[PDB]
């Protein structure tokens, strides 16, 4: 860029606006970056709802299995009373991310129920109840990748502008001080100085002329 | 210090008419002939155009399609500097893609070897046609593949599948003018309807 | 006693004057011009500014006891509610804590009626401490790390 005074003006300004851009980039993703680690530990406390749940839902077909042998399963599935399975999106906001919330039948709304089997009420309070657990892993998962996403792309624009845009720009504006200051002061001194030279010469010759006569 | 700013630099520059500016960075990484392609200029293109004319119809139009696709290469150098490599487009890449050829295989001369000490204009004549002939097929490609995956997607597979054809196209420069000139022009045109029958048969199977 | 009055041409302290007058004085006192944007009359950035020997007035003979503990606290806060509110910024001030609206009302409290003497409205040190306290004594008493002991149970309870 050429080099002048509000030259190096504006590429100051520029770089004090990059290092304030940069300290809140790096608070916003510090954040998110707190959300996803919170996340993902609830993550992994939840991941043993799963095995739990399912140990459970497990006894219950077991139970079932032994009072009313084969299930009808094929045209009704048998199996369950609840869940009459149908979810429902909601999308939550943090730190700027637009987190989903899911709700579903025997998670939430959407949720219906008819007769049942034998053990159909053991079956819905143990197959049916790890549908809630379910749901809550899935809004968790979920939430975690779109964190992770929304992370990855902030480290990548505070990443960018620590090494590129700043140590672009803090050259730029050393070039310009050095443009200015050690070739335009120099030269006006210089300037000056063959002046006071070109007087002090014209002085002496007039106090030569005038010796001489 | 390299600066153009320089009176000397100045002031030739406001009355040369061709201009082989050079660039230390690709100095630094041994390119030898050091020009750099973005800043230089030229004149004298329009005086020349009978003598391109009388020469080959063909240069003075795949002179300006390398021209674009130099810029369009620093362009996307400086979008990919900040914004990463992934969410290019297939042509995108495909543009990044014989660019990266024009440049280590085209543009670059060691200046101190049998082949690169001298070049034959029509041979690089050739060059640039050959270059030029795989940006178009391959953006043809991209055109129509029988669905958008099948179009421009496949520049991965058509690294692999026409490789054989990309490494004679980076390695073509590597013969020496001093074998005779027929037979540098009969193997730069047998390269060319190899790669052009070749692409052309991948974009005609399965698409 | 001097308080020289300095123009800093282009808003910037990189100018010859003010450069050259840093090294002969100890402080710095300057005036912001967003702070004259805000029409806070008083526009004196505190935070940039500072003295470079302000520990010789605070002491207990002279002055009050409390006064450099008030002002690190004041300092120490207003930071934080600046950091806070530029932070809320960018995070919708949704997910905030309650400390980071504490700040933040501390923040505009201490803008729109601290810094915003009047022309004529003449304080005591006393009464400005006074209102420095007021300010203050919205955090818990925990909460104030940089008080030290036995000045927070003298002037907490108001």
Same mark, same amino acid.
């Given at each position: 860029?050429?080099?002048?005074?509000?030259?190096?003006?504006?590429?100051?300004?520029?770089?004090?606006?990059?290092?304030?851009?940069?300290?809140?980039?790096?608070?916003?993703?510090?954040?998110?970056?707190?959300?996803?680690?919170?996340?993902?530990?609830?993550?992994?406390?939840?991941?043993?709802?799963?095995?739990?749940?399912?140990?459970?839902?497990?006894?219950?077909?077991?139970?079932?299995?032994?009072?009313?042998?084969?299930?009808?399963?094929?045209?009704?599935?048998?199996?369950?009373?609840?869940?009459?399975?149908?979810?429902?999106?909601?999308?939550?906001?943090?730190?700027?991310?637009?987190?989903?919330?899911?709700?579903?039948?025997?998670?939430?709304?959407?949720?219906?129920?008819?007769?049942?089997?034998?053990?159909?009420?053991?079956?819905?309070?143990?197959?049916?109840?790890?549908?809630?657990?379910?749901?809550?892993?899935?809004?968790?998962?979920?939430?975690?990748?779109?964190?992770?996403?929304?992370?990855?792309?902030?480290?990548?624009?505070?990443?960018?502008?620590?090494?590129?845009?700043?140590?672009?720009?803090?050259?730029?504006?050393?070039?310009?001080?050095?443009?200015?200051?050690?070739?335009?002061?120099?030269?006006?001194?210089?300037?000056?100085?063959?002046?006071?030279?070109?007087?002090?010469?014209?002085?002496?010759?007039?106090?030569?002329?005038?010796?001489?006569? | 210090?390299?600066?153009?700013?320089?009176?000397?630099?100045?002031?030739?520059?406001?009355?040369?008419?061709? #201009?082989?500016?050079?660039?230390?960075?690709?100095?630094?990484? *041994?390119?030898?002939?050091?020009?750099?392609?973005?800043?230089?200029?030229?004149?004298?293109?329009?005086?020349?155009?009978?003598?391109?004319?009388?020469?080959?119809?063909?240069?003075?139009?795949?002179?300006?399609?390398?021209?674009?696709?130099?810029?369009?290469? +620093?362009?996307?150098?400086?979008?990919?500097?900040?914004?990463?490599?992934?969410?290019?487009?297939?042509?995108?890449?495909?543009?990044?893609?014989?660019?990266?050829?024009?440049?280590?295989?085209?543009?670059?001369?060691?200046?101190?070897?049998?082949? +690169?000490?001298?070049?034959?204009?029509?041979?690089?004549?050739?060059?640039?046609?050959?270059?030029?002939? #795989?940006?178009?097929?391959?953006?043809?490609?991209?055109?129509?593949?029988?669905?958008?995956?099948?179009?421009?997607?496949?520049?991965?597979?058509?690294?692999?599948?026409?490789?054989?054809?990309?490494?004679?196209?980076?390695?073509?420069?590597?013969?020496?003018?001093?074998?005779?000139?027929?037979?540098?022009?009969?193997?730069? *045109?047998?390269?060319?309807?190899?790669?052009?029958?070749?692409?052309?048969?991948?974009?005609?199977?399965?698409? | 006693?001097?308080?020289?009055?300095?123009?800093?041409?282009? @808003?910037?302290?990189?100018?010859?004057?003010? @450069?050259?007058?840093?090294?002969?004085?100890?402080?710095?006192?300057?005036?912001?011009?967003?702070?004259?944007?805000?029409?806070?009359?008083?526009?004196?950035?505190?935070?940039?500014?500072?003295?470079?020997?302000?520990?010789?007035?605070?002491?207990?003979?002279?002055?009050?006891? @409390?006064?450099?503990?008030?002002?690190?606290?004041?300092?120490?806060?207003?930071?934080?509610?600046?950091?806070?509110?530029?932070?809320?910024?960018?995070?919708?001030?949704?997910?905030?804590?309650?400390? @980071?609206?504490?700040?933040?009302?501390?923040?505009?409290?201490?803008?729109?009626?601290?810094?915003?003497?009047?022309?004529?409205?003449?304080?005591?040190?006393?009464?400005?401490?006074?209102?420095?306290?007021?300010?203050?004594?919205?955090?818990?008493?925990?909460?104030?790390?940089?008080?030290?002991?036995?000045?927070?149970?003298?002037?907490?309870?108001?």
């Amino acid at each position: 860029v050429v080099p002048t005074v509000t030259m190096l003006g504006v590429m100051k300004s520029r770089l004090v606006g990059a290092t304030r851009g940069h300290a809140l980039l790096k608070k916003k993703s510090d954040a998110l970056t707190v959300q996803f680690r919170q996340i993902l530990k609830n993550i992994v406390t939840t991941k043993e709802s799963m095995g739990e749940v399912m140990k459970d839902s497990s006894f219950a077909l077991i139970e079932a299995k032994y009072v009313a042998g084969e299930n009808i399963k094929h045209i009704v599935l048998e199996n369950v009373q609840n869940a009459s399975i149908k979810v429902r999106s909601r999308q939550e906001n943090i730190a700027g991310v637009k987190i989903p919330k899911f709700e579903y039948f025997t998670d939430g709304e959407t949720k219906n129920d008819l007769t049942g089997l034998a053990r159909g009420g053991q079956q819905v309070q143990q197959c049916r109840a790890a549908y809630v657990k379910a749901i809550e892993l899935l809004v968790e998962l979920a939430s975690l990748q779109t964190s992770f996403l929304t992370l990855d792309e902030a480290i990548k624009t505070t990443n960018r502008r620590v090494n590129a845009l700043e140590n672009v720009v803090k050259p730029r504006l050393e070039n310009t001080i050095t443009y200015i200051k050690g070739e335009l002061d120099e030269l006006e001194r210089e300037d000056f100085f063959r002046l006071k030279k070109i007087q002090g010469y014209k002085k002496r010759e007039i106090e030569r002329q005038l010796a001489s006569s | 210090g390299g600066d153009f700013s320089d009176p000397v630099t100045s002031a030739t520059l406001s009355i040369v008419q061709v #201009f082989w500016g050079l660039d230390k960075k690709l100095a630094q990484r *041994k390119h030898f002939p050091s020009v750099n392609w973005l800043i230089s200029y030229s004149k004298y293109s329009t005086a020349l155009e009978s003598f391109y004319e009388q020469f080959d119809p063909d240069f003075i139009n795949i002179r300006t399609k390398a021209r674009e696709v130099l810029q369009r290469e +620093d362009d996307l150098n400086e979008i990919v500097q900040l914004v990463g490599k992934d969410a290019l487009a297939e042509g995108d890449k495909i543009t990044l893609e014989t660019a990266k050829l024009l440049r280590e295989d085209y543009l670059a001369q060691n200046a101190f070897t049998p082949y +690169d000490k001298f070049c034959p204009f029509y041979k690089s004549v050739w060059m640039m046609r050959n270059i030029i002939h #795989f940006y178009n097929l391959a953006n043809q490609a991209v055109e129509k593949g029988a669905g958008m995956d099948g179009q421009k997607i496949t520049y991965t597979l058509i690294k692999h599948r026409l490789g054989d054809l990309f490494y004679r196209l980076v390695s073509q420069k590597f013969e020496d003018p001093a074998e005779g000139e027929p037979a540098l022009v009969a193997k730069f *045109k047998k390269l060319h309807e190899d790669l052009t029958a070749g692409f052309r048969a991948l974009e005609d199977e399965t698409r | 006693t001097q308080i020289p009055i300095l123009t800093m041409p282009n @808003d910037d302290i990189t100018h010859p004057t003010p @450069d050259l007058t840093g090294y002969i004085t100890e402080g710095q006192i300057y005036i912001d011009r967003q702070l004259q944007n805000r029409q806070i009359y008083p526009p004196i950035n505190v935070l940039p500014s500072l003295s470079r020997l302000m520990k010789s007035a605070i002491g207990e003979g002279m002055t009050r006891r @409390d006064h450099s503990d008030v002002s690190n606290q004041l300092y120490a806060n207003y930071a934080i509610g600046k950091d806070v509110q530029a932070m809320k910024a960018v995070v919708g001030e949704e997910a905030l804590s309650s400390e @980071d609206l504490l700040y933040l009302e501390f923040l505009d409290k201490f803008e729109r009626k601290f810094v915003a003497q009047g022309a004529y409205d003449s304080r005591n040190i006393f009464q400005s401490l006074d209102l420095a306290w007021t300010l203050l004594r919205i955090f818990p008493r925990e909460l104030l790390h940089r008080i030290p002991g036995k000045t927070l149970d003298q002037y907490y309870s108001r």
